[model samples]
Target: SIKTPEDIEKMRVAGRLAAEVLEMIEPYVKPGVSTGELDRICNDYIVNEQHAVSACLGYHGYPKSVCISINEVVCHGIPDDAKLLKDGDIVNIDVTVIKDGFHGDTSKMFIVGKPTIMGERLCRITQESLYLALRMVKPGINLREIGAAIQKFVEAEGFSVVREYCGHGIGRGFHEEPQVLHYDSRETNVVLKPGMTFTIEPMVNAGKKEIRTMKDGWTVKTKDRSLSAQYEHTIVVTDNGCEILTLRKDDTIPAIISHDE
Candidate 1:
Protein backbone atom coordinates (compact mmCIF):
# COMPACT_ATOMS: atom_id res chain seq x y z
CA SER A 1 0.00 0.00 0.00
CA ILE A 2 1.18 3.50 -0.82
CA LYS A 3 1.43 5.70 2.24
CA THR A 4 -0.25 9.01 1.74
CA PRO A 5 1.58 12.17 2.80
CA GLU A 6 -0.51 12.15 5.94
CA ASP A 7 0.41 8.52 6.57
CA ILE A 8 4.10 9.19 5.98
CA GLU A 9 4.08 11.96 8.55
CA LYS A 10 2.53 9.69 11.11
CA MET A 11 4.97 6.94 10.16
CA ARG A 12 7.96 9.21 10.80
CA VAL A 13 6.73 9.87 14.30
CA ALA A 14 6.18 6.21 15.05
CA GLY A 15 9.49 5.28 13.50
CA ARG A 16 11.42 7.75 15.61
CA LEU A 17 9.90 6.32 18.76
CA ALA A 18 10.93 2.81 17.80
CA ALA A 19 14.47 3.98 17.19
CA GLU A 20 14.51 5.78 20.55
CA VAL A 21 13.69 2.58 22.40
CA LEU A 22 16.73 0.87 20.91
CA GLU A 23 18.93 3.83 21.81
CA MET A 24 17.51 4.02 25.30
CA ILE A 25 18.21 0.36 25.95
CA GLU A 26 21.86 0.47 24.96
CA PRO A 27 23.49 1.15 28.33
CA TYR A 28 21.27 -1.36 30.10
CA VAL A 29 22.57 -4.20 27.96
CA LYS A 30 25.63 -4.79 30.09
CA PRO A 31 26.59 -7.97 31.93
CA GLY A 32 24.24 -9.50 34.52
CA VAL A 33 21.19 -7.81 33.02
CA SER A 34 18.22 -10.06 32.45
CA THR A 35 16.47 -9.98 29.11
CA GLY A 36 13.21 -9.59 31.04
CA GLU A 37 14.53 -6.42 32.68
CA LEU A 38 15.42 -4.97 29.31
CA ASP A 39 11.92 -5.71 28.10
CA ARG A 40 10.35 -3.97 31.10
CA ILE A 41 12.40 -0.81 30.64
CA CYS A 42 11.52 -0.53 26.99
CA ASN A 43 7.87 -1.27 27.69
CA ASP A 44 7.69 1.48 30.29
CA TYR A 45 9.46 4.00 28.07
CA ILE A 46 7.16 3.26 25.16
CA VAL A 47 4.06 3.49 27.32
CA ASN A 48 4.85 6.48 29.54
CA GLU A 49 7.49 8.60 27.82
CA GLN A 50 6.52 8.06 24.23
CA HIS A 51 2.80 7.56 24.88
CA ALA A 52 2.86 4.73 22.38
CA VAL A 53 1.75 1.10 22.41
CA SER A 54 4.12 -1.84 22.46
CA ALA A 55 3.02 -3.43 19.24
CA CYS A 56 4.61 -6.81 19.95
CA LEU A 57 3.29 -7.43 23.45
CA GLY A 58 0.21 -9.26 22.42
CA TYR A 59 1.17 -9.70 18.79
CA HIS A 60 -0.07 -13.13 17.80
CA GLY A 61 0.14 -14.14 21.45
CA TYR A 62 3.71 -13.02 21.82
CA PRO A 63 4.28 -12.75 25.58
CA LYS A 64 6.82 -9.95 25.65
CA SER A 65 6.94 -6.32 24.66
CA VAL A 66 10.22 -6.91 22.83
CA CYS A 67 12.09 -9.87 21.42
CA ILE A 68 15.43 -10.49 23.16
CA SER A 69 17.41 -13.07 21.29
CA ILE A 70 20.93 -13.90 22.41
CA ASN A 71 23.81 -15.99 21.08
CA GLU A 72 22.44 -18.66 18.80
CA VAL A 73 18.86 -17.46 18.98
CA VAL A 74 17.96 -16.40 15.48
CA CYS A 75 14.73 -14.48 16.22
CA HIS A 76 11.51 -14.43 18.22
CA GLY A 77 13.34 -15.21 21.44
CA ILE A 78 11.02 -14.30 24.27
CA PRO A 79 12.38 -12.24 27.14
CA ASP A 80 12.77 -14.13 30.41
CA ASP A 81 14.04 -13.33 33.86
CA ALA A 82 15.99 -16.56 33.81
CA LYS A 83 17.84 -15.43 30.73
CA LEU A 84 20.58 -13.24 32.19
CA LEU A 85 22.99 -11.77 29.67
CA LYS A 86 26.69 -12.42 30.28
CA ASP A 87 29.94 -11.16 28.88
CA GLY A 88 30.68 -12.06 25.28
CA ASP A 89 26.99 -12.54 24.53
CA ILE A 90 25.57 -11.15 21.33
CA VAL A 91 21.97 -10.08 21.67
CA ASN A 92 19.32 -8.89 19.26
CA ILE A 93 16.60 -6.64 20.59
CA ASP A 94 13.62 -6.22 18.28
CA VAL A 95 11.11 -3.46 18.91
CA THR A 96 7.89 -2.36 17.27
CA VAL A 97 5.68 0.42 18.51
CA ILE A 98 2.34 1.83 17.44
CA LYS A 99 1.70 5.55 17.61
CA ASP A 100 -1.16 7.49 16.12
CA GLY A 101 -2.28 4.38 14.27
CA PHE A 102 1.00 3.70 12.48
CA HIS A 103 3.64 1.09 13.31
CA GLY A 104 7.43 1.33 13.44
CA ASP A 105 9.49 -1.83 13.50
CA THR A 106 13.26 -2.07 13.99
CA SER A 107 15.94 -4.24 15.58
CA LYS A 108 19.70 -4.20 16.20
CA MET A 109 22.47 -6.40 17.52
CA PHE A 110 24.17 -5.52 20.81
CA ILE A 111 27.20 -7.05 22.43
CA VAL A 112 26.72 -7.50 26.18
CA GLY A 113 30.17 -6.88 27.62
CA LYS A 114 32.91 -8.46 25.53
CA PRO A 115 32.42 -9.80 22.04
CA THR A 116 33.63 -12.92 20.32
CA ILE A 117 35.60 -12.57 17.13
CA MET A 118 33.00 -14.32 15.01
CA GLY A 119 30.03 -12.76 16.80
CA GLU A 120 31.21 -9.19 16.26
CA ARG A 121 32.13 -9.79 12.66
CA LEU A 122 28.80 -11.50 11.96
CA CYS A 123 26.93 -8.52 13.36
CA ARG A 124 28.94 -6.00 11.35
CA ILE A 125 28.57 -7.89 8.10
CA THR A 126 24.84 -8.34 8.64
CA GLN A 127 24.40 -4.61 9.16
CA GLU A 128 26.51 -3.86 6.12
CA SER A 129 24.26 -6.10 4.06
CA LEU A 130 21.23 -4.17 5.24
CA TYR A 131 22.87 -0.86 4.36
CA LEU A 132 23.82 -2.09 0.92
CA ALA A 133 20.20 -3.04 0.28
CA LEU A 134 18.97 0.27 1.71
CA ARG A 135 21.16 2.18 -0.73
CA MET A 136 19.41 0.40 -3.60
CA VAL A 137 15.90 1.47 -2.66
CA LYS A 138 14.58 3.76 -5.38
CA PRO A 139 11.69 3.95 -7.76
CA GLY A 140 11.86 1.31 -10.54
CA ILE A 141 14.21 -1.18 -8.86
CA ASN A 142 12.86 -4.70 -8.55
CA LEU A 143 12.08 -5.87 -5.02
CA ARG A 144 14.30 -8.90 -5.66
CA GLU A 145 17.25 -6.53 -5.94
CA ILE A 146 17.01 -5.97 -2.21
CA GLY A 147 17.62 -9.65 -1.44
CA ALA A 148 20.10 -10.07 -4.25
CA ALA A 149 22.37 -7.39 -2.88
CA ILE A 150 22.17 -8.88 0.60
CA GLN A 151 22.80 -12.44 -0.56
CA LYS A 152 25.74 -11.54 -2.77
CA PHE A 153 27.50 -9.58 -0.05
CA VAL A 154 26.70 -11.93 2.82
CA GLU A 155 27.75 -15.04 0.92
CA ALA A 156 31.00 -13.43 -0.11
CA GLU A 157 31.67 -12.80 3.59
CA GLY A 158 31.27 -16.54 4.24
CA PHE A 159 28.10 -16.04 6.25
CA SER A 160 24.74 -17.65 5.47
CA VAL A 161 21.43 -15.81 5.32
CA VAL A 162 18.41 -17.25 7.11
CA ARG A 163 15.78 -18.17 4.57
CA GLU A 164 12.64 -18.90 6.57
CA TYR A 165 11.96 -15.48 8.04
CA CYS A 166 11.91 -12.66 5.50
CA GLY A 167 11.05 -9.03 6.18
CA HIS A 168 7.51 -7.81 5.62
CA GLY A 169 5.59 -4.66 4.74
CA ILE A 170 4.77 -2.86 7.98
CA GLY A 171 2.68 0.24 8.74
CA ARG A 172 -0.71 -0.01 10.44
CA GLY A 173 -0.11 -3.74 10.58
CA PHE A 174 2.85 -5.16 12.41
CA HIS A 175 3.41 -7.50 9.45
CA GLU A 176 2.08 -6.59 6.04
CA GLU A 177 2.46 -7.57 2.41
CA PRO A 178 5.41 -8.04 0.04
CA GLN A 179 7.59 -10.32 2.15
CA VAL A 180 11.14 -9.00 1.85
CA LEU A 181 13.69 -11.82 1.49
CA HIS A 182 17.31 -11.70 2.59
CA TYR A 183 18.40 -13.95 -0.27
CA ASP A 184 17.63 -13.62 -3.95
CA SER A 185 14.26 -15.13 -4.79
CA ARG A 186 11.85 -14.88 -7.70
CA GLU A 187 8.78 -14.62 -5.44
CA THR A 188 9.12 -10.89 -4.66
CA ASN A 189 8.99 -9.55 -8.17
CA VAL A 190 7.25 -6.30 -7.29
CA VAL A 191 8.86 -3.06 -8.45
CA LEU A 192 9.69 -0.27 -6.04
CA LYS A 193 7.35 2.70 -6.07
CA PRO A 194 7.13 5.91 -4.11
CA GLY A 195 5.28 5.69 -0.76
CA MET A 196 5.40 1.91 -0.50
CA THR A 197 6.76 0.73 2.86
CA PHE A 198 8.52 -2.43 4.03
CA THR A 199 11.33 -3.73 6.22
CA ILE A 200 14.79 -4.91 5.10
CA GLU A 201 16.03 -7.22 7.87
CA PRO A 202 18.78 -9.69 7.13
CA MET A 203 19.37 -12.50 9.63
CA VAL A 204 22.90 -13.84 9.11
CA ASN A 205 24.40 -16.91 10.67
CA ALA A 206 28.08 -17.42 11.36
CA GLY A 207 27.69 -21.05 10.41
CA LYS A 208 24.99 -22.72 8.30
CA LYS A 209 21.70 -20.92 7.75
CA GLU A 210 19.55 -23.82 8.97
CA ILE A 211 17.32 -22.92 11.96
CA ARG A 212 14.77 -24.55 14.22
CA THR A 213 12.10 -23.23 16.54
CA MET A 214 12.10 -24.30 20.14
CA LYS A 215 9.12 -26.08 21.65
CA ASP A 216 7.97 -22.78 23.15
CA GLY A 217 7.07 -21.99 19.54
CA TRP A 218 8.73 -18.60 19.15
CA THR A 219 12.44 -18.66 19.90
CA VAL A 220 14.22 -19.56 16.69
CA LYS A 221 17.79 -20.76 16.90
CA THR A 222 20.52 -21.88 14.60
CA LYS A 223 20.37 -25.63 14.10
CA ASP A 224 24.12 -25.94 14.49
CA ARG A 225 24.06 -23.71 17.59
CA SER A 226 26.13 -21.06 15.85
CA LEU A 227 25.95 -17.37 16.62
CA SER A 228 23.39 -15.40 14.63
CA ALA A 229 22.93 -11.67 14.08
CA GLN A 230 20.40 -9.37 12.45
CA TYR A 231 19.66 -5.68 11.75
CA GLU A 232 16.41 -4.13 10.68
CA HIS A 233 14.89 -0.82 9.57
CA THR A 234 11.53 0.17 8.17
CA ILE A 235 11.75 2.15 4.94
CA VAL A 236 9.54 3.81 2.36
CA VAL A 237 10.25 4.10 -1.31
CA THR A 238 10.64 7.77 -2.26
CA ASP A 239 10.91 9.62 -5.55
CA ASN A 240 14.67 9.98 -5.33
CA GLY A 241 15.29 6.94 -3.22
CA CYS A 242 14.07 5.73 0.19
CA GLU A 243 13.62 7.21 3.64
CA ILE A 244 14.50 5.18 6.73
CA LEU A 245 11.50 5.48 8.98
CA THR A 246 13.28 3.77 11.87
CA LEU A 247 16.71 5.35 11.42
CA ARG A 248 18.60 5.74 14.70
CA LYS A 249 20.28 8.90 15.93
CA ASP A 250 23.76 7.34 15.93
CA ASP A 251 23.27 5.48 12.66
CA THR A 252 26.25 5.89 10.32
CA ILE A 253 23.94 5.86 7.31
CA PRO A 254 21.76 8.80 6.37
CA ALA A 255 18.01 8.73 6.89
CA ILE A 256 17.54 9.34 3.22
CA ILE A 257 19.61 8.55 0.14
CA SER A 258 18.85 8.97 -3.53
CA HIS A 259 19.38 6.45 -6.28
CA ASP A 260 22.06 7.53 -8.67
CA GLU A 261 20.66 8.25 -12.10
Candidate 2:
Protein backbone atom coordinates (compact mmCIF):
# COMPACT_ATOMS: atom_id res chain seq x y z
CA SER A 1 0.00 0.00 0.00
CA ILE A 2 2.55 2.59 -1.12
CA LYS A 3 0.88 6.02 -1.17
CA THR A 4 1.75 9.47 -2.43
CA PRO A 5 0.90 12.68 -0.57
CA GLU A 6 -2.06 13.30 -2.81
CA ASP A 7 -3.39 9.84 -1.98
CA ILE A 8 -2.56 10.14 1.71
CA GLU A 9 -4.41 13.43 1.98
CA LYS A 10 -7.62 11.86 0.81
CA MET A 11 -6.98 8.90 3.05
CA ARG A 12 -6.70 11.35 5.92
CA VAL A 13 -10.29 12.38 5.36
CA ALA A 14 -11.35 8.78 5.62
CA GLY A 15 -9.22 8.25 8.69
CA ARG A 16 -10.61 11.24 10.58
CA LEU A 17 -14.20 10.23 10.04
CA ALA A 18 -13.44 6.65 10.97
CA ALA A 19 -12.01 7.80 14.27
CA GLU A 20 -14.88 10.21 14.72
CA VAL A 21 -17.28 7.34 14.48
CA LEU A 22 -15.47 5.83 17.45
CA GLU A 23 -16.04 9.07 19.28
CA MET A 24 -19.65 9.24 18.19
CA ILE A 25 -20.47 5.75 19.43
CA GLU A 26 -18.88 5.96 22.88
CA PRO A 27 -22.14 7.04 24.56
CA TYR A 28 -23.83 3.86 23.41
CA VAL A 29 -21.12 1.40 24.45
CA LYS A 30 -22.76 0.72 27.77
CA PRO A 31 -24.63 -2.02 29.60
CA GLY A 32 -27.88 -3.56 28.29
CA VAL A 33 -27.01 -2.93 24.63
CA SER A 34 -26.63 -5.53 21.92
CA THR A 35 -23.60 -5.59 19.69
CA GLY A 36 -25.88 -5.73 16.66
CA GLU A 37 -27.30 -2.33 17.56
CA LEU A 38 -23.78 -1.00 17.82
CA ASP A 39 -23.25 -2.31 14.33
CA ARG A 40 -26.29 -0.42 13.03
CA ILE A 41 -25.34 2.84 14.73
CA CYS A 42 -21.86 2.75 13.28
CA ASN A 43 -23.21 1.87 9.87
CA ASP A 44 -25.64 4.77 9.89
CA TYR A 45 -22.99 7.29 10.80
CA ILE A 46 -20.43 5.97 8.36
CA VAL A 47 -22.96 6.21 5.56
CA ASN A 48 -25.06 9.22 6.52
CA GLU A 49 -22.85 11.46 8.64
CA GLN A 50 -19.38 10.64 7.39
CA HIS A 51 -20.59 9.88 3.88
CA ALA A 52 -18.19 6.98 3.67
CA VAL A 53 -18.88 3.35 3.10
CA SER A 54 -17.81 0.69 5.55
CA ALA A 55 -14.89 -1.38 4.36
CA CYS A 56 -15.94 -4.42 6.37
CA LEU A 57 -19.46 -4.77 4.98
CA GLY A 58 -19.42 -6.84 1.76
CA TYR A 59 -15.70 -7.40 2.12
CA HIS A 60 -15.14 -11.10 1.46
CA GLY A 61 -18.80 -11.51 2.42
CA TYR A 62 -18.42 -10.03 5.89
CA PRO A 63 -21.84 -8.97 7.16
CA LYS A 64 -21.28 -6.03 9.48
CA SER A 65 -20.04 -2.47 9.38
CA VAL A 66 -17.88 -2.74 12.47
CA CYS A 67 -16.24 -5.74 14.11
CA ILE A 68 -17.83 -5.93 17.60
CA SER A 69 -15.78 -8.58 19.33
CA ILE A 70 -16.31 -9.00 23.07
CA ASN A 71 -14.81 -10.87 26.04
CA GLU A 72 -12.74 -13.80 24.82
CA VAL A 73 -13.34 -12.91 21.17
CA VAL A 74 -10.16 -11.88 19.39
CA CYS A 75 -11.37 -10.73 15.96
CA HIS A 76 -13.92 -11.05 13.18
CA GLY A 77 -16.71 -11.30 15.77
CA ILE A 78 -20.07 -10.76 14.17
CA PRO A 79 -22.42 -8.53 16.08
CA ASP A 80 -25.66 -10.16 17.26
CA ASP A 81 -28.23 -9.94 20.04
CA ALA A 82 -27.44 -13.38 21.38
CA LYS A 83 -25.65 -11.89 24.39
CA LEU A 84 -26.36 -8.70 26.30
CA LEU A 85 -23.35 -6.55 27.17
CA LYS A 86 -23.36 -6.28 30.95
CA ASP A 87 -21.06 -4.52 33.35
CA GLY A 88 -17.35 -5.43 33.42
CA ASP A 89 -17.31 -6.63 29.81
CA ILE A 90 -14.52 -5.47 27.54
CA VAL A 91 -15.48 -4.89 23.91
CA ASN A 92 -13.40 -4.14 20.85
CA ILE A 93 -14.80 -2.11 17.96
CA ASP A 94 -12.95 -2.09 14.65
CA VAL A 95 -13.82 0.44 11.96
CA THR A 96 -12.74 0.92 8.38
CA VAL A 97 -13.95 3.97 6.51
CA ILE A 98 -13.59 4.15 2.76
CA LYS A 99 -13.66 7.53 1.03
CA ASP A 100 -12.57 8.67 -2.40
CA GLY A 101 -11.62 5.06 -3.10
CA PHE A 102 -9.10 4.96 -0.21
CA HIS A 103 -9.46 3.35 3.23
CA GLY A 104 -8.80 4.22 6.86
CA ASP A 105 -8.57 1.40 9.40
CA THR A 106 -8.51 1.51 13.19
CA SER A 107 -9.83 -0.25 16.27
CA LYS A 108 -10.02 0.35 20.02
CA MET A 109 -10.90 -1.44 23.26
CA PHE A 110 -13.71 -0.12 25.46
CA ILE A 111 -14.00 -1.05 29.13
CA VAL A 112 -17.63 -1.27 30.17
CA GLY A 113 -18.86 0.05 33.48
CA LYS A 114 -16.94 -1.30 36.47
CA PRO A 115 -14.71 -3.70 34.58
CA THR A 116 -12.92 -6.43 36.48
CA ILE A 117 -9.31 -5.85 37.41
CA MET A 118 -8.23 -8.64 35.12
CA GLY A 119 -10.31 -7.26 32.23
CA GLU A 120 -9.05 -3.75 32.78
CA ARG A 121 -5.46 -4.92 32.76
CA LEU A 122 -5.83 -6.74 29.45
CA CYS A 123 -7.17 -3.67 27.64
CA ARG A 124 -4.59 -1.32 29.06
CA ILE A 125 -1.64 -3.56 28.28
CA THR A 126 -2.86 -4.41 24.85
CA GLN A 127 -3.27 -0.73 24.01
CA GLU A 128 0.15 0.08 25.38
CA SER A 129 1.56 -2.80 23.40
CA LEU A 130 0.05 -1.35 20.23
CA TYR A 131 1.63 2.01 21.01
CA LEU A 132 4.95 0.25 21.60
CA ALA A 133 4.70 -1.45 18.21
CA LEU A 134 3.83 1.81 16.43
CA ARG A 135 6.98 3.40 17.84
CA MET A 136 8.97 0.87 15.82
CA VAL A 137 7.79 2.54 12.61
CA LYS A 138 10.14 4.54 10.33
CA PRO A 139 12.03 4.20 7.08
CA GLY A 140 14.54 1.34 6.71
CA ILE A 141 12.97 -0.48 9.68
CA ASN A 142 12.14 -4.16 9.46
CA LEU A 143 8.45 -4.96 9.83
CA ARG A 144 9.13 -7.96 12.05
CA GLU A 145 10.85 -5.71 14.57
CA ILE A 146 7.46 -4.20 15.47
CA GLY A 147 5.97 -7.60 16.19
CA ALA A 148 9.05 -8.76 18.10
CA ALA A 149 8.95 -5.77 20.41
CA ILE A 150 5.22 -6.20 20.93
CA GLN A 151 5.56 -9.86 21.89
CA LYS A 152 8.41 -9.17 24.31
CA PHE A 153 6.56 -6.39 26.10
CA VAL A 154 3.32 -8.35 26.33
CA GLU A 155 5.14 -11.31 27.86
CA ALA A 156 6.81 -8.97 30.33
CA GLU A 157 3.32 -7.85 31.33
CA GLY A 158 2.23 -11.46 31.84
CA PHE A 159 0.12 -11.62 28.69
CA SER A 160 0.18 -13.51 25.39
CA VAL A 161 0.09 -12.19 21.83
CA VAL A 162 -2.53 -13.59 19.51
CA ARG A 163 -0.24 -15.12 16.92
CA GLU A 164 -3.00 -16.08 14.50
CA TYR A 165 -3.92 -12.41 13.93
CA CYS A 166 -1.49 -9.54 13.49
CA GLY A 167 -1.30 -6.36 11.44
CA HIS A 168 -1.34 -5.96 7.66
CA GLY A 169 -0.87 -3.46 4.89
CA ILE A 170 -3.89 -1.17 4.34
CA GLY A 171 -4.95 1.39 1.80
CA ARG A 172 -7.08 1.34 -1.37
CA GLY A 173 -7.08 -2.48 -1.28
CA PHE A 174 -7.86 -2.91 2.42
CA HIS A 175 -5.24 -5.70 3.11
CA GLU A 176 -2.13 -6.02 0.99
CA GLU A 177 1.51 -7.08 1.27
CA PRO A 178 3.89 -6.99 4.25
CA GLN A 179 2.46 -9.42 6.77
CA VAL A 180 3.13 -8.03 10.25
CA LEU A 181 3.62 -10.77 12.81
CA HIS A 182 3.23 -9.98 16.51
CA TYR A 183 6.13 -12.09 17.69
CA ASP A 184 9.86 -12.42 17.39
CA SER A 185 10.84 -13.78 14.03
CA ARG A 186 13.66 -14.85 11.80
CA GLU A 187 12.17 -12.98 8.84
CA THR A 188 14.79 -11.85 6.39
CA ASN A 189 12.80 -9.57 4.09
CA VAL A 190 9.96 -7.04 4.51
CA VAL A 191 11.66 -3.79 5.42
CA LEU A 192 9.69 -0.61 5.92
CA LYS A 193 10.09 2.17 3.40
CA PRO A 194 8.99 5.75 3.05
CA GLY A 195 5.45 6.31 1.71
CA MET A 196 4.29 2.86 2.78
CA THR A 197 0.95 2.42 4.55
CA PHE A 198 -0.09 -0.33 6.96
CA THR A 199 -1.73 -1.04 10.29
CA ILE A 200 -0.24 -1.94 13.71
CA GLU A 201 -3.11 -3.61 15.49
CA PRO A 202 -1.88 -5.75 18.37
CA MET A 203 -4.20 -8.37 19.85
CA VAL A 204 -3.07 -9.53 23.29
CA ASN A 205 -4.73 -12.22 25.36
CA ALA A 206 -4.88 -12.66 29.14
CA GLY A 207 -3.90 -16.32 28.97
CA LYS A 208 -2.63 -18.53 26.14
CA LYS A 209 -2.25 -17.35 22.55
CA GLU A 210 -3.90 -20.43 21.15
CA ILE A 211 -7.30 -19.59 19.57
CA ARG A 212 -10.12 -21.33 17.79
CA THR A 213 -13.03 -20.40 15.52
CA MET A 214 -16.75 -20.82 16.01
CA LYS A 215 -18.90 -22.88 13.67
CA ASP A 216 -19.86 -19.71 11.80
CA GLY A 217 -16.19 -19.39 10.78
CA TRP A 218 -16.27 -15.66 11.60
CA THR A 219 -16.04 -15.39 15.39
CA VAL A 220 -12.55 -16.04 16.80
CA LYS A 221 -11.78 -16.30 20.48
CA THR A 222 -9.09 -17.48 22.85
CA LYS A 223 -8.86 -21.23 23.28
CA ASP A 224 -8.37 -20.85 27.02
CA ARG A 225 -11.54 -18.72 27.14
CA SER A 226 -9.58 -15.88 28.72
CA LEU A 227 -10.22 -12.23 28.02
CA SER A 228 -8.46 -10.48 25.13
CA ALA A 229 -7.94 -6.90 24.03
CA GLN A 230 -6.59 -5.08 20.97
CA TYR A 231 -5.80 -1.64 19.53
CA GLU A 232 -5.07 -0.48 16.00
CA HIS A 233 -4.03 2.56 13.96
CA THR A 234 -3.30 3.08 10.31
CA ILE A 235 0.08 4.61 9.61
CA VAL A 236 1.77 6.21 6.63
CA VAL A 237 5.53 6.01 6.55
CA THR A 238 6.96 9.53 6.37
CA ASP A 239 10.47 10.79 5.69
CA ASN A 240 10.93 11.69 9.34
CA GLY A 241 9.09 8.68 10.74
CA CYS A 242 5.41 7.66 10.64
CA GLU A 243 2.12 9.52 10.82
CA ILE A 244 -0.83 7.98 12.70
CA LEU A 245 -3.77 8.83 10.45
CA THR A 246 -6.47 7.59 12.79
CA LEU A 247 -5.80 9.86 15.75
CA ARG A 248 -9.03 11.36 17.08
CA LYS A 249 -9.64 15.04 17.79
CA ASP A 250 -9.06 14.21 21.44
CA ASP A 251 -6.45 11.54 21.14
CA THR A 252 -5.08 9.32 23.93
CA ILE A 253 -7.18 7.35 26.36
CA PRO A 254 -8.28 8.85 29.67
CA ALA A 255 -5.27 8.81 31.95
CA ILE A 256 -7.40 8.63 35.07
CA ILE A 257 -9.09 5.39 34.06
CA SER A 258 -6.26 3.89 31.99
CA HIS A 259 -3.55 3.56 34.58
CA ASP A 260 0.18 3.13 33.94
CA GLU A 261 0.26 -0.33 35.45
* Candidate 1 local lDDT, 16-133, one digit each (tens): 9999999999999999999999999999999999999999987778999999999999999999988899999999999999999999999999998778888889999999999999
Residue pairs in collision within model 2: none
Q: Write one digit per residue (lDDT tens) for candidate 2, span 1-261.
A: 578899888878888788888989999999999999999999999998888899999888998899999999999899897667899999999999999998899999888888899998888898888777676677777877777889999999999998877788887888877788888878625878888888888888999999999998789999999998988888788765778888865556321121113
The CA lDDT of each predicted structure is: 0.93, 0.85
Off by over 4 Å in 2: 253-261
Q: Show pairs that collide, candidate 1.
A: none
TM-score of 2: 0.94
Candidate 2 lDDT score relative to the true structure? 0.85
